[PDB]
């Protein structure tokens with residue numbers, strides 16, 4: 001039995017257009033461990049992205065945190081793109097901007 | 099405050115490239131402390147207060163142990179796959195650890211999983227292994243025949259593990275034992291016509307353990323409360339929320355402090 005990743009996209013602080021913030025993509029509850037994650041700004045991969053090492057949960061699934069520094073604008077759209085064996089093609093999850 | 103020490107092992111057969119055959123990492127509470135894998139073949143710190151407090155001799159000695167544990171894990175996965183007549187890539191996992199509770203009592207656990215599911219569970223109080231199926235029962239019989247190993251693992255869980263944890267807690271005390279209180283607000287909004295949603299949102303808190311609930315007229319709710327996961331904000335602190343529909347009040351407890359936000 002395989003478990004597809006839960007994907008949650010949110011800002012570090014309550015978002016406000018114009019003020020420096022951080023964008024998080026928390027990817028969790030998946031199994032097996034192999035996984036691919038990118039942050040996207042207007043459909044294109046962001047390159048200066050931090051991430052934690054693969055992490056282990058008590059229920060044997062895994063989790064990861066990807067983040068990047070950003071300044072939210074009304075115009076720009078951010079997302080988190082994820083691939084995993086349970087997925088036919090990469091899943092793109094839009095940030096809902098609070 | 100309650101704390102815990104645990105180590106995981108992860109074994110993958112026939113892995114894709116980029117995926118190590120074997121990984122082992124340690125945690126104190128939610129914080130990574132150690133890591134080893136079949137590519138580095140080295141045990142390394144994952145917290146600065148581990149690196150500063152354990153001499154090179156520690157990393158050397160446990161690197162050798164891990165290299166040994168890596169090979170055992172490979173063989174055990176192969177034997178399991180054979181038992182299940184499985185081919186292709188499968189996973190094998192171990193978790194061992196202990197908790198030092200607030201009241202001072204303790205907890206210990208040791209479990210194995212196959213393809214991400216419970217396989218064998220150790221009971222240190224009976225010195226027995228609980229098996230989920232006939233394959234695990236086969237493995238159990240072998241392990242339960244070795245009385246000394248069972249005694250040894252009971253001792254490690256109850257004495258050694260707890261001693262390691264206390265040791266690590268002191269090393270990382272500036273981190274592990276700090277308190278950062280939640281910033282909490284209630285948000286109100288009409289969504290669907292007629293409906294009013296009430297979100298109680300907390301962020302900026304450490305440790306991640308937080309209690310949030312909604313109440314009406316000073317007593318327990320009965321309607322459906324929705325809970326946000328407790329999520330890492332990336333700076334060492336966490337965030338979370340709870341919502342209901344619609345005098346209401348949000349109640350938050352964190353590290354010995356209770357907070358009430360009355361919805362006017």
Ligand SMILES: *[C@@H](C)/C=N/c1c(NC[C@H](O)[C@H](O)[C@H](O)CO)[nH]c(=O)[nH]c1=O
Pocket residue numbers: 105106107122123124132134141160164194251254
């Ligand atoms: C550095 C101390 C890494 N330790 C480590 C351990 N350590 C706990 C324990 O000695 C070990 O699990 C024995 O097998 C218990 O009988 N365990 C682990 O799985 N990974 C580690 O990196």
